[PDB]
Amino acid sequence: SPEFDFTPAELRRFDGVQDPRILMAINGKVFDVTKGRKFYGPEGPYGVFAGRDASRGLATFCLDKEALKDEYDDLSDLTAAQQETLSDWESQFTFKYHHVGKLLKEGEEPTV
Amino acid sequence: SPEFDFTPAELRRFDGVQDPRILMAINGKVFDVTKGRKFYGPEGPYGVFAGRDASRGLATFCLDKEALKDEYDDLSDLTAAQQETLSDWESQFTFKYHHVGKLLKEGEEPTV
Numbered sequence: 039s040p041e042f043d044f045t046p047a048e049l050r051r052f053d054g055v056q057d058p059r060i061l062m063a064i065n066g067k068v069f070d071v072t073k074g075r076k077f078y079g080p081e082g083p084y085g086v087f088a089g090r091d092a093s094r095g096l097a098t099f100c101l102d103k104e105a106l107k108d109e110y111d112d113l114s115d116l117t118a119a120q121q122e123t124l125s126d127w128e129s130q131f132t133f134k135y136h137h138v139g140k141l142l143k144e145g146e147e148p149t150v
Numbered sequence: 151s152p153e154f155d156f157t158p159a160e161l162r163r164f165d166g167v168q169d170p171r172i173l174m175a176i177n178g179k180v181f182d183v184t185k186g187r188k189f190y191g192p193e194g195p196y197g198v199f200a201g202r203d204a205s206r207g208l209a210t211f212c213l214d215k216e217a218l219k220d221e222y223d224d225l226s227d228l229t230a231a232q233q234e235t236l237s238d239w240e241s242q243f244t245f246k247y248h249h250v251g252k253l254l255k256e257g258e259e260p261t262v
């Protein structure tokens with residue numbers, strides 16, 4: 039929590055459609071990617087990640103919507119390589135976008 | 151069959167490892183992608199497609215290995231958009247690589 043922590047269910051409405059803001063989680067961190075609407079908007083190539091935990095899709099290079107989990111995604115089955123890929127993506131989003139807070143894991147308590 | 155048609159089981163060994171040749175199917179067409187070993191070899195980024203029907207992975211933009219089907223993949227559940235993507239990929243492989251023959255669908259008889 040630099041600002042506010044979210045559960046996955048709480049993140050869903052921030053998809054650029056139900057709310058003009060687009061939030062997206064990568065490796066436990068929620069980013070404000072509203073300025074990247076060309077990517078994450080409803081007509082964007084990566085719109086499947088809007089309001090979602092994008093970790094598994096980014097880590098495995100998979101845009102298939104049916105591959106996204108609805109609630110909590112335990113990433114413990116990712117390979118070493120997929121985990122390294124996920125970390126690379128996290129670094130890029132950290133550089134480019136505002137970090138809003140944590141995506142809470144199941145049972146994890148909020149901060150601030 | 152410009153040369154030879156394959157079932158998915160017959161295609162498997164052409165992965166650059168069990169055989170130096172790498173064959174790959176896209177939208178029912180088998181291509182010789184041996185010259186693209188930098189992509190499809192065992193250390194390549196797209197090695198998951200070597201000796202496989204790559205149609206679903208290319209169409210849905212998904213490199214996740216567990217998403218590949220082992221035998222015949224009925225593509226009838228792809229979306230209109232995924233089908234258009236698959237066609238785009240087919241055009242590119244047609245331009246770049248040698249077309250060997252058909253990937254036989256289940257029950258489909260060989261030609262020549």
Ligand code: HEM
Binds near residue numbers: 134212
């Ligand atoms: C042939 C396949 C792909 C190609 C050639 C490609 C190419 C690109 C290019 C050129 C950019 C930069 C866009 C720009 O700055 O205008 C980009 C950004 C990006 N790509 Fe792709 N991509 C592909 C597939 C994928 C897949 C499968 C994923 C995720 C599962 C993905 C996720 C992303 C993300 C998250 C960005 C960052 C956009 C941002 O700056 O926030 N891409 N890609």
Ligand code: HEM
Binds near residue numbers: 186189207
């Ligand atoms: C951020 C994600 C991605 C980026 C930036 C990206 C970028 C690229 C680039 C730059 C090339 C040309 C390589 C060269 O000519 O040296 C390429 C080729 C290719 N990409 Fe990706 N890619 C991404 C993800 C994917 C995914 C998810 C798939 C498939 C599911 C994919 C499939 C392919 C294929 C089949 C080629 C053709 C190689 C050939 O010429 O046979 N890519 N990509």
